Amino acid sequence: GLMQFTLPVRLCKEIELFHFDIGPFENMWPGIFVYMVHRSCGTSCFELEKLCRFIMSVKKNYRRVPYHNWKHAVTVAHCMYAILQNNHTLFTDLERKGLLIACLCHDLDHRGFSNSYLQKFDHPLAALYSTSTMEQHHFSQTVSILQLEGHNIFSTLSSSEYEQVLEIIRKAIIATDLALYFGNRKQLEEMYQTGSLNLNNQSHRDRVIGLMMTACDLCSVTKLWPVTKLTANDIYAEFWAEGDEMKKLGIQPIPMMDRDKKDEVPQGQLGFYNAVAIPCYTTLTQILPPTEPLLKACRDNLSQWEKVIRGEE
Ligand SMILES: Cc1nc2ccccc2nc1N1CCCC1
Ligand SMILES: [Mg+2]
Ligand SMILES: [Zn+2]
Known part of the structure; x- marks a missing residue:
């Protein structure tokens, strides 16, 4: 129990900042995740x-897609780590356990395709889970890996603590369905402004945890411009693949997914930052003030996209 993970000095310092990039060395990511668990949760939380x-079975069940990959999983876990560290006393022992694992698992067995494509393809998962189709699949896969012999990292929780942690993880992963984010954030907006937000009300915490998941899941928009810019290529490589597949189903895709309409991307990113990212981190900052660095990074990147459109890059 006296074995700590230790990271090189630049990583040891940069990992604590929201804008940390986990870097191109895949073999270091599991150690980065464990390091984050040890400092966020404790060296005793997990055997x-x-x-x-568990980590290595999770990694193996991420596919080789341009964006929805093992790197995304660990990137999203790191943003949750930063939120949790900058808000020490707001979160229970279970919540800190569940949420880092929820983030690592949230896109398990992703194929690079949206819930919409599965429905128009008539994929078997769309018959099994009529809404939040991939997200219900990600929770299923998380539970499957937990039930592999030797993989139950929760085995020392009590019956009821164990049911609490799996309930946190389930909601956490469902909340990453961006279709549910819009209504979730509107509700937190009203609650915060009419003063009725109440962090002892379990249904309120749930909403707040869901917004944190949307924030972590979108955190590509909160990195330094070079990282944001280069990730957007991966994001759009998946979208164009899906647009290709829509066209093979004899359906014109939305311009976002049409690789013939790449020119329209800078404007597409503006509407996204204005309609999703900025609102998300604004409301997050209102509820959890020390997450303001995410809002400041996001606004900085909105400004960089404006510059692309004005032809300044
Ligand atoms: C357009 C877009 N850009 C992103 C840029 C950074 C991170 C995530 C992003 N997600 C996006 N999608 C997800 C569903 C609608 C548009
Ligand atoms: Mg997802
Ligand atoms: Zn994701």
Whole structure:
């Protein structure tokens, strides 16, 4: 129990900042995730033998897609880590356990295609889960890996603590369905402004945890411009693939997914920052003030996209 993970000095310092990039060395990501668990949760939270075998089974069940990949999983876990560290006393022992694992698992077995494409393809998962189709699949896959022999990192929780942690993880992963974010944030907006937000009300915490998941899941928009810019290529490589597949179903895709309409991308990113990202981190900052660095990074990147459109890059 005296074995800490330690990181090189630049990573040790930069990992604590919201805008940290986990870097191109895949073999270091599991150690980065464990390091984050040890400092966020404790060295006692998980049996290291079990956690290591969980992490490696999770990694193996991420596919080789341009964006919805193992790197996305660890990137999203790091943003949750930063939120949790900058808000020490607001979160229970279980919530800190569940949420880092929820983030790591939130896109398990992603194929690079939206819930819409599955429905128009008539994919079997769309018959199994009529709404939040991939997100219900990600929770299913998370539970499957937890039930592999030697993989139950929760085995030392009590019956009821265990049911609490899986309930946190389920809602957490469902909340990453961006179709649910709009209504979720409107509600938190009203609650915050009419003063009725109440962090002891479990249905309120749930809404707040859901907004944190949307924030972590979108955190590509909160990195330094070079990282944001280069990730957007991966994001759009998946969208264009899906647009290609829509065209093979004899359906014109929305311009976002049409690779013939790449010119329209800078404007597409503006509407996204204005309609999703900025509102998301604004309301997050209102509820959890120390997350303001995400809002400032997001606004900085909105400004960079404006410059692309004005031909200044
Ligand atoms: C357009 C877009 N850009 C993003 C840029 C950074 C991170 C996530 C992003 N997600 C996006 N999608 C998801 C569903 C609608 C548009
Ligand atoms: Mg997802
Ligand atoms: Zn995701």
